[PDB]
Design a protein around this ligand. Structure first.
Ligand SMILES: OC[C@H]1O[C@H](O[C@H]2O[C@H](CO)[C@@H](O)[C@H](O)[C@H]2O)[C@H](O)[C@@H](O)[C@@H]1O
Lengths: 58, 62
């Protein structure tokens, strides 16, 4: 699934992904807690973030 | 200065990390914005829990 960061996200935890507004992401929703596992296509970084910081694109 | 403020959870937040604060929608919170990453240090006034959450998941009410 592809998505776009709708808000800036600065990690507090090492497993997290830094997001800038409008970063294109490849994304798997983790249904147990509504975090995304993500790849930031701008930065090449991989990590998790809380799902409400991005929206799915089609 | 980012002074303490009253807030409400606008989204459900389930921790992945031990230092995090569980939110339910419309939880009243006492909140101090941490400027280095825009996480809130927070007290959940419903649950009595202490912890951090990302700022987008609540709205200031003061
Ligand atoms: O006497 C302790 C400090 O009290 C104030 O700080 C608290 O209250 C503030 C106003 O609501 C908050 O912004 C802050 O988060 C609290 O620590 C005061 O501002 C400080 O100068 C005092 O040292």
């Amino acid at each position: 699934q592809t998505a776009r960061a709708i808000f800036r996200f600065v990690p507090r935890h090492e497993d997290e992904l830094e997001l800038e507004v409008d970063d294109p992401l490849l994304v798997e929703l983790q249904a147990e807690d509504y975090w995304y596992e993500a790849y930031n296509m701008r930065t090449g970084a991989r990590g998790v973030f809380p799902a409400y910081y991005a929206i799915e694109v089609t």
